[PDB]
Amino acid sequence: GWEVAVRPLLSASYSAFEMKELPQLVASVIESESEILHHEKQYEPFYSSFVALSTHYITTVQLQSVAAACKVLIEFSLLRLENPDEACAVSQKHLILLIKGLCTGCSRLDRTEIITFTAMMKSAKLPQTLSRQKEVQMNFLNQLTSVFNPRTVASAIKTKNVFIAQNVASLQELGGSEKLLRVCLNLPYFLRYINRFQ
């Protein structure tokens, strides 16, 4: 179910993020991948807030799964920044800061917004209202299929560096540079300035 999937975020909203709560969050993010990008209107704010909390708690701190989940979140934020729908729980600005924060050391989101995000979390209705061997085998298969770098690129700084390298590689893989430049060019307010310069 999805209630048990969002349980770690609900528990951690009043504290830090427990280390034991990360791998199952990653597993849930990878498992629901086929559905996350395709949803109806009324579930959309719930999934947007869930993604916001998940990204926030990932950036505040096995590498292959984390990289895959971060790539998934970057893809989600990318097509959310391209389309953006009126009823998105997180506006385009916070998506931009989120994408930046995943590529940096998590100094963008503030408490004043995650309180509203958790309130929406509780007030939103579930897809399926909120108000050990399988995971190990999956990790084994993930490590087996592809080889992580590691050294091609004290402990905390190097882990952060490899995390940033993986995240920026994932962002570049989607070709997000062109999409971000396109979304920045056709702004509703800079359009007059661009026309005047032309």
Partner: protein
């Protein structure tokens, strides 16, 4: 793999085990280290035939697929001996390892699909069980003659293999053929058969294994009506134990009676380790069963003579073992025997013993202290089966396992390996004799005294003379005013006369 491949591999394992056991005679002299790995793999297959454990995934990830010590689940006690003999804190190469986690040490749930395959076509379970019972003697003749030392590797491999075989044999369900072989009579039984028989007869008594036995007997084609009657008539309890152990004692006495009189026995005629620990297990089981039977309270009318004959034969055995380790000529060997027959220092009655032992210059001093320093503490205590072993379902089986491990641990020694085994078996035998003499209405004084005084004043039996002293004190005299002191003095004069008359050269 798929189910078909796994069952084919299991059938191939069955075929290998069945085929390899046909030439047991050659196997007596081999070192079963490859056999140990085969049995370990078979045990793992039996435990986890269907699923795959998580620790296997972690081990294969860390040891192989991670970028560049390995991680395994080796035996703690075997690796204890290996590291002790390796000394300088290196242990770089692991040679004795186990695949299954130690968490399965608790009573070891057999796989349903494994036994479903075992009780079906393409396998012959009866001959498989026969081969597994026969393979328990795959290293009996290794210790036997060339004066060649037994290295650490071979002793560790022997203990490792025996532990693996004992573990696997205690998990496989019964076969109907052996049930019939033991049901209404128990003939032509070998040492491995006896070793399996004691543990089984203790198992299917009170520990509620009988339901498991009949449940598995329903499989393989034996309906409940036959199984219940066979289980009922297989065990009815103390009489069965005394009968089987009396038969074993009679066979051992008949085997050893070919040697008589007072002659020095070579090392090669010393019994092998397997027979020694089989006898020790049998006597320990008898002691436990008799102790409980008369604690809760004519069957011992024939135990006494057989036990006394066992004791005096084993006293001759240990005396010969000590003597032949002293190239000395045979005449001065008999002279040394005459000196040490009246030796010993653990009895205060005699006075010459210590001085005559100590005045010999070098030959029988360093060897004497090295042999007398073999302390048998590692064995279970006197009544350790009553306090530390009664909490489990079967204290007797736990006692048997403990004494078996203690016997197996002695193979690592390089100076005097067998000494611990002979000392402990003599101690247990004399303690059983004392308990039985306490618990028997029939008692023949002359037999017991003329087989018991030689223990107290013998230098080769000093870790035991105290127990014999306590046993004789309560029945024959307070050792101070009664005729016991007179008999001790008489034996002293007999020894003095013999040494002064025969070996004056």
């Amino acid at each position: 793999f798929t189910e078909t491949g796994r069952r084919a591999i299991l059938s191939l394992f069955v075929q290998i085990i069945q085929e390899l056991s046909v030439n047991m005679d050659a196997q007596m002299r081999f070192v079963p280290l490859i056999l140990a790995r085969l049995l370990l793999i078979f045990d793992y297959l039996l435990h986890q035939y269907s699923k795959a454990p998580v620790y296997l995934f972690e081990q294969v990830q860390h040891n192989l697929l991670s970028p560049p010590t390995p991680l395994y689940h080796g035996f703690k006690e075997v690796e204890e001996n290996w590291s002790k003999h390796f000394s300088s804190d290196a242990v770089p190469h692991p040679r004795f390892y186990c695949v299954l986690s130690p968490e399965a040490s608790e009573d070891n749930r057999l796989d349903s699909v494994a036994c479903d395959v075992l009780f079906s076509k393409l396998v012959k379970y009866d001959e498989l069980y026969a081969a597994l019972t026969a393979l328990l003697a795959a290293g009996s003749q290794l210790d036997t003659k060339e004066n060649k030392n037994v290295t650490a590797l071979e002793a560790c491999a022997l203990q490792y293999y025996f532990l693996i075989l004992w573990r696997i044999l205690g998990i496989l369900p019964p076969s109907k053929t052996y049930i019939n072989q033991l049901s209404m009579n128990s003939p032509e039984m070998s040492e491995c058969d006896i070793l399996h028989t004691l543990r089984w007869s203790s198992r299917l008594r009170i520990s509620s294994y009988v339901n498991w036995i009949k449940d598995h007997l329903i499989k393989q084609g034996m309906k409940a009506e036959h199984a219940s009657s066979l289980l009922e008539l297989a065990s009815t309890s103390v009489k069965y134990d005394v009968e089987i152990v009396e038969e074993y004692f009679a066979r051992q006495i008949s085997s050893f009676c070919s040697i008589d009189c007072t002659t020095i026995l070579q090392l090669h005629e010393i019994p092998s380790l397997q027979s020694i620990y089989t006898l020790d297990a049998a006597i320990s089981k008898v002691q436990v069963s008799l102790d409980e039977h008369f604690s809760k309270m004519e069957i011992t009318k024939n135990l006494l003579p057989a036990t006394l004959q066992l004791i005096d034969t084993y006293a001759s055995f240990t005396r010969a073992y000590l003597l032949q380790n002293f190239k000395p000529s045979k005449e001065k060997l008999q002279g040394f025997a005459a000196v040490l027959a009246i030796g010993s220092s653990r009895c205060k009655a005699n006075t010459l013993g210590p001085t005559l032992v100590q005045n010999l210059p070098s030959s029988v001093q360093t060897v004497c202290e090295s042999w007398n320093n073999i302390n048998t503490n590692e064995f279970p205590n006197i009544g350790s089966w009553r306090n530390a072993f009664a909490n489990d379902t079967i204290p007797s089986e736990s006692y048997i396992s403990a004494v078996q491990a203690a016997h197996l641990g002695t193979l690592c020694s390089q100076s005097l390996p067998l000494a611990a085994s002979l000392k402990h078996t003599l101690l247990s035998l004399v303690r059983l004799t004392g308990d039985l003499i306490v618990w028997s209405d029939e008692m023949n004084p002359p037999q017991v005294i003329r087989t018991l005084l030689p223990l107290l004043l013998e230098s080769s039996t000093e870790s035991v003379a105290e127990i014999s002293s306590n046993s004789l004190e309560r029945i024959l005299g307070p050792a101070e005013s009664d005729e016991f002191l007179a008999r001790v003095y008489e034996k002293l004069i007999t020894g003095c006369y013999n040494i002064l008359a025969n070996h004056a050269d």
